[PDB]
Amino acid sequence: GFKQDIATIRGDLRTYAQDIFLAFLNKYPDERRYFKNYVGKSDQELKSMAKFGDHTEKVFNLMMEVADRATDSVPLASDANTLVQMKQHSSLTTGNFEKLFVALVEYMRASGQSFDSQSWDRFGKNLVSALSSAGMK
Amino acid sequence: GFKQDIATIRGDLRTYAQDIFLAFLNKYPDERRYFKNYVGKSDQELKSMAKFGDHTEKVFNLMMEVADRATDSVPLASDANTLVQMKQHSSLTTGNFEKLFVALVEYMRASGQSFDSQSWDRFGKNLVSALSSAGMK
Numbered sequence A, B: 001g002f003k004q005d006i007a008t009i010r011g012d013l014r015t016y017a018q019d020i021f022l023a024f025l026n027k028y029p030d031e032r033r034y035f036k037n038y039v040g041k042s043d044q045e046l047k048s049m050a051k052f053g054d055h056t057e058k059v060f061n062l063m064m065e066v067a068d069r070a071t072d073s074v075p076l077a078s079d080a081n082t083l084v085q086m087k088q089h090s091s092l093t094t095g096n097f098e099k100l101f102v103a104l105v106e107y108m109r110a111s112g113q114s115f116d117s118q119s120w121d122r123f124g125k126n127l128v129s130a131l132s133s134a135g136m137k
């Protein structure tokens, strides 16, 4: 289930973080503009840029912490607040986050690795609701 | 994105080249008049002609190079010049090129693969503008 999925992802965080992040940018190419250093780079090209590995690592580490602190795929109000208040997310709306989770769920469904994809969909919806409660437009 | 799409196509070049070129010819069957020995043949008959596979490969090899040398899907002027000045292209107008890119973009949208179709549309439009600047009618 969801908790095991967190263990799956954490076990090979670099690979899953990079895979899912690329799935996100490739599914929603207009999202790439937020990451100006990734413009004009193929998947394999990004995988040798230090910042790309570091960014995806840090993002998915945090996402897993929020996931782990959730109850029944409902994230904590304080965690939603952390995500809204981050300077790096100041220009974002909840639509950006929906897109990420749609891509993430599609990735999991397409994987050969078992995942509780429905629970990640639910988590994404609940996080979107929490981001709104916390003041993201 | 666009840069990744170049890798995707190069990773199965012969197959994508023939499939995209066939989409082009089937969408615009009167374009066959610029070629030799294509009329009156099905997709499979075309794919069994040695010259067909070799032509499509050479076209797509070069097209991917032009894409790869571009910045933000804007091709180099010298690449546009080369395409205009090729003896094989002497009787073409930019309309021929726009049709090829309409078919290519349509192919990408219809595919099961995550292409950045809008960036290929821009690339086609930018190529046409560049071909015009290079003197193609």
Ligand code: HEM
Residues within 6 Å of the ligand: A031, A034, A035, A054, A055, A058, A059, A060, A062, A063, A083, A088, A089, A092, A096, A097, A100
């Ligand atoms: C739950 C989902 C998300 C989490 C946990 C998360 C987490 C993070 C973290 C930890 C950083 C800082 C990383 C570092 O300092 O290296 C960061 C930066 C950033 N995030 Fe997010 N993020 C999420 C969703 C999104 C979405 C959906 C977008 C926009 C499409 C986005 C856009 C950005 C941008 C542009 C930066 C700055 C990166 C840079 O300057 O190189 N984030 N995020």
Ligand code: HEM
Residues within 6 Å of the ligand: B031, B034, B035, B036, B055, B058, B059, B060, B062, B063, B083, B088, B089, B092, B096, B097, B100
């Ligand atoms: C960016 C788009 C295009 C690229 C990269 C491209 C590239 C090429 C290349 C590499 C060749 C082979 C020349 C040689 O063997 O030395 C070729 C030949 C040719 N191309 Fe293109 N081409 C493009 C668009 C077009 C279009 C739109 C048409 C017509 C609708 C066209 C018509 C032809 C013809 C008629 C030949 C000669 C074929 C023959 O041997 O009978 N090309 N092209």
Ligand SMILES: [N+]
Residues within 6 Å of the ligand: A015, A018, A019, A020, A022
């Ligand atoms: N990946």
Ligand SMILES: [N+]
Residues within 6 Å of the ligand: B019
């Ligand atoms: N195809």
